[PDB]
């Protein structure tokens, strides 16, 4: 039953705004009531602007990828270390969180490829290798394709 | 010093072919010698064909996403359960492995968004909430944007 000032609403609306933002920077749109949608549209504009900030994009790409969590809290803490607060900073932090999702994944695709390659090559070694040797290895497939 | 029939070369070349394939279905191209590149080009054609197999795409999307590893080995085992082997089956298995990478990630993006949202909202609750309450919650940001 809390209003906008309530911690409940601040956390609920903050989650909807952030999720919508992260999906903007990208599947289906987060359902939002009319007022919240109006905020989201403004955040979309700020995100659009910051996406064209080429220096910022270069630096986000340049960040060490091993622990995105450490990166997030170091940036967040650093941003607000002078004890000052304003809405511009809050929105810029949300923007950074959205870019971190894209960045983090950029680590994920390589790791997923390596993991899935592991399964496939494991199956191949233990189940297919004998038959492939009977073909004289992959040079057999060269033949197969008429090469 | 093994030739194409050697398990060493079969595993090495198999890894290069599979990695190239997975990257085809998608960053930079796997470096391949001339003969291996020739195979890769044939695999690209088969992948291209199977990508237009709409039924197959529907089913891959329909698969339960929780354990991609179980899915891989069940499919692989099922494919070869009649004890028969041929190059067409080997290539189709490689194709499936490539699609599993894309599928797996499709689970990853949601999980990454939720994880990164967790950090952001944690920071917000513990560091920003007081100031945001002073604004009367997110309705303050509505004002800020002139809404």
């Amino acid at each position: 039953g809390g209003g906008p000032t309530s911690s409940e609403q601040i956390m609920k609306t903050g989650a909807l705004l952030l999720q919508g933002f992260i999906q903007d920077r990208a599947l289906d749109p987060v359902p939002q009531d009319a007022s919240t949608k109006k905020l989201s549209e403004s955040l979309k504009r700020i995100g659009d602007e910051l996406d064209s900030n080429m220096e910022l994009q270069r630096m986000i790409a340049a960040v060490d990828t091993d622990s995105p969590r450490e990166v997030f809290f170091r940036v967040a803490a650093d941003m607000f270390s002078d004890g000052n607060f304003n809405w511009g900073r809050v929105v810029a932090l949300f923007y950074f969180a959205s870019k971190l999702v894209l960045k983090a994944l950029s680590t994920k695709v390589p790791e997923l490829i390596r993991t899935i390659m592991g399964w496939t090559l494991d199956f191949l070694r233990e189940r297919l290798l004998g038959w492939i040797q009977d073909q004289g290895g992959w040079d057999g497939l060269l033949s197969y394709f008429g090469s | 010093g093994g030739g194409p029939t050697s398990s060493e070369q079969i595993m090495k070349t198999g890894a290069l072919l599979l990695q190239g394939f997975i990257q085809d279905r998608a960053l930079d191209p796997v470096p391949q010698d001339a003969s291996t590149k020739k195979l890769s080009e044939s695999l690209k054609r088969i992948g291209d064909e199977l990508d237009s197999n709409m039924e197959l795409q529907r089913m891959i999307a329909a698969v339960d996403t929780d354990s991609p590893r179980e899915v891989f080995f069940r499919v692989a085992a099922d494919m070869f359960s009649d004890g028969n082997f041929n190059w067409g089956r080997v290539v189709a298995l490689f194709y499936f492995a490539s699609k599993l990478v894309l599928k797996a990630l499709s689970t990853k993006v949601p999980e990454l968004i939720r994880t990164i949202m967790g950090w952001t909202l944690d920071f917000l609750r513990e560091r920003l909430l007081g100031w945001i309450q002073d604004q009367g919650g997110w309705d303050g940001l509505l004002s800020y944007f002139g809404s």
């Binding site: 630096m59 340049a62 060490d64 170091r74 967040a76 650093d78 304003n86 809405w87 900073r89 | -």
Partner: peptide, 22 residues
């Protein structure tokens, strides 16, 4: 460190936004 550069750039951006929106 790129992390510190980014924190500095986001703070700058935020405070610039605030100057224009307030």
């Amino acid at each position: 460190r790129p992390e510190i550069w980014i924190a500095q750039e986001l703070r700058r951006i935020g405070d610039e936004f605030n100057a224009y929106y307030a």
